[model samples]
Structure formats: structure tokens, C-alpha cells
Target: DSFSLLSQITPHQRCSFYAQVIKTWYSDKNFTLYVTDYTENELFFPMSPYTSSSRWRGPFGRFSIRCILWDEHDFYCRNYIKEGDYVVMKNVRTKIDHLGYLECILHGDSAKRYNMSIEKVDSEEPELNEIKSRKRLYV
Candidate 1:
């Protein structure tokens, strides 16, 4: 299913999911996002660390998934996306990182052809309410 939840999604699948952005940052090239649907996934990265101190806004434990975006996906997010915004990530390809954890990636080619994209969701959406409810249970 394209609109799968983070808890049920596994590495190697191309899928989309609805989740709230917890944190965002960028390197010289790629855009990285930490997001969650309030569902725990053991394969995800555990936390975030800034240079001065670690500050993670996502739910506790392994509830967040990291998504790396390139090209157009990166461009659009840099212009509009922000933490706490709920979004639908389309055509994501999951990959296992060096830490043996799974992460999401949006390739430039896939993104350009409309095969992959990031679409923000409104707060009034019922699914956002569902995510909010689950997040409340954890945090």
C-alpha cells in the first residue's frame, strides 16, 4: 500500500506515508528530515544531536524515521516545509544505513518525473488527528 504507516513499513519498499515533521536540517547537498507518525519502528535512528546539545522534538525511543531528499524534493522543502508540518511522502525508497537502521530517500530522477514528491497536509485532516492521538499516547 502506498499510504502505509511507519510502523508497518519495511526497508526496500517504495511507498508513501503520512507523518509530522519533527526536525529538519541540511548538508551542503541533501535535505534531511526527522518525522514520525507516532508509531515505533525498531529499525529507525534513535535520536538527534546538535553541536551544542541534543534536542529531539519527535516521540521517544524509535518512533521517528529519517528521510533524505535530493534536488526538487530538497528545493521545495527548503522553501516551504518546517517542523511540526504534517506531510505525505510519496514514492520513497527505503534503505539500510551503516548503523543497520532503515531510512527513507527521495532520488532526484524519481522526484522530477512526479514519481516521488512531498505533499503537506492540513491540520484539520482526520488522519493528522489520528497521528496526533497516537503521539499523545507516547509523549
Candidate 2:
């Protein structure tokens, strides 16, 4: 219900957005993923702990950002999410790293705030299509 445009998110804000998972990585203590719902106007602010510069290419070249999953959410995402899965993010925290890139994090109460429901929708879902259409108009 809190769905919003990733482009409208600013550092230190709490918002929800939809994105398709591109990849996921995890270890005993860390869990993260690269996801995208690109817009014509870049969603990331250029700066520097935005993870790594490697995110700028390949499948994440545009309208993508890294997301961190903590604790229970970490384990849940590891098991439930995969490359190309569509998901609705909720009550996630957004921040600008030292590098100025946008990032999303799910932790503790905030992590519990959203069910992190995964969905299989056509790439043309309204919210995603809206962003895509806007991109075309701006370009």
C-alpha cells in the first residue's frame, strides 16, 4: 500500500517500492541483493559505502540499487528471493552512502514492518510501467 517511485526516495527516508531481483549474495553474517525498477532519471545519487562501483554495469547499469537484509529478514530473503523475482518492498529504509549512491536496508522492527512479499507479475505492472513510461517521455 505504501508503494512509491524509487526516484522520489531521498536519503534517510522510509519508503516502499517494487523491483525485480537481479542477483543475491549471502554469507553467515551478511545478505544483500541487487535489484532494479529503473527510471529515466537516475535513481542513484553519485557519491561513495554504496557497496561497490561494480554495480554500475551488467544488469544493474540503470535504475538499480543494492539492498541489505538483516537478521530474520536476511534469512528470509536468502530463501525466498532469487534472480528475476518481482517483489514489493515495504517499510524499508533508504540512505545515501558516502559515495552518494542510494541503498535500501531492512532491519529489526523495520524489517518486520513489511511482509516482503514476492510476486510474479508481468514486467508491465502499473508501477513499473509508469516509471518506464516516464523514462521514455524524459528521454
How do all models score by TM-score? 0.88, 0.69
List of clashing residue pairs for candidate 2? 47-99, 47-100, 48-98, 48-99, 48-100
Backbone clashes counted, model 2: 5
lDDT of 2 by residue, 1-139 (tens): 4677766777787788777676788989868887766552265643233565665332323466788888877877787787777677777888777777778888755534555433445666775665455445523
Q: Which number leads on lDDT?
A: 1
Q: What's the true lDDT of residue 41 in model 2?
A: 25
Q: How far does residue 117 in candidate 1 sit from its true spot (Å)?
A: 1.1
